[PDB]
Amino acid sequence: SMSVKKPKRDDSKDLALCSMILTEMETHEDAWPFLLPVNLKLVPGYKKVIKKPMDFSTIREKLSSGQYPNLETFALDVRLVFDNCETFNEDDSDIGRAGHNMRKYFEKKWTDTFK
Numbered sequence: 137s138m139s140v141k142k143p144k145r146d147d148s149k150d151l152a153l154c155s156m157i158l159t160e161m162e163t164h165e166d167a168w169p170f171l172l173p174v175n176l177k178l179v180p181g182y183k184k185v186i187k188k189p190m191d192f193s194t195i196r197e198k199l200s201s202g203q204y205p206n207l208e209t210f211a212l213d214v215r216l217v218f219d220n221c222e223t224f225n226e227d228d229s230d231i232g233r234a235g236h237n238m239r240k241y242f243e244k245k246w247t248d249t250f251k
Contacts (some may be wrong), residue, residue: 146184150207154199157245161192161214164194164241166234170217190216214242 161167173191176183195213206209221235 147207149187151199154204154207154210157242157249158192158196158199158214160245161238161242162196164238166237167192169221169231169234170238182224186220188216188220190220192217211246215239218242 225232231233
């Protein structure tokens with residue numbers, strides 16, 4: 137509360153460490169459904185159904201330009217990418233399985249780097 141603060145967690149490396157995680161996600165062999173924004177002209181149904189599209193290139197640009205206020209807003213966009221994928225793709229599809237694999241990969245890196 138006013139003039140009463142918990143001890144200061146060092147966040148000075150968070151930007152660099154989120155960048156490194158994002159690099160590892162970008163280079164995973166199952167990243168291909170997620171590298172670029174879904175083409176809303178060529179994929180029927182996407183625009184209406186997926187209210188907040190997100191992809192790794194968009195996260196990379198947001199990260200590089202100071203549009204994440206803290207590491208939690210960064211994790212929320214990564215998770216959005218996989219939540220969108222599960223909303224639109226059957227579990228038993230190449231893209232559906234890709235999304236589950238990447239979400240697992242992310243969550244481990246996130247826990248190991250920050251928890």
